[PDB]
Chains A and B, each alone.
Chain A
Amino acid sequence: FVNQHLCGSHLVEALYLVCGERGFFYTPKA
């Protein structure tokens, strides 16, 4: 489900599901 265009809340959701208890960092303006 990660091999597509993931934008906004859709991207944040993907990171949440993939990283799990590890957590993640979301930096849009990079």
Chain B
Amino acid sequence: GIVEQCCTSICSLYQLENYCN
């Protein structure tokens, strides 16, 4: 999930945009 990819590990714009509507 987003926590595993952006909190416990370093986030990225690619990852963040996957969560935009």
Chain A residues engaging chain B, CB cutoff 8 angstroms: 2-8, 11, 14-15, 18-20, 22-30
Contact = CB atoms under 8 A, between A and B. Distances in A.
Interface of B: 1-4, 6-13, 16-17, 19-21
B13 to A, nearest CB: 5
Majority-rule SS of A interface residues: loop
A28 B3 contact: yes
A20 to B, nearest CB: 8
The 3 A-B residue pairs with the shortest CB-CB distance in the complex, in nearest-first order: A30-B1, A19-B20, A7-B7
B7 to A, nearest CB: 4
A4 B19 contact: no
B21 to A, nearest CB: 4
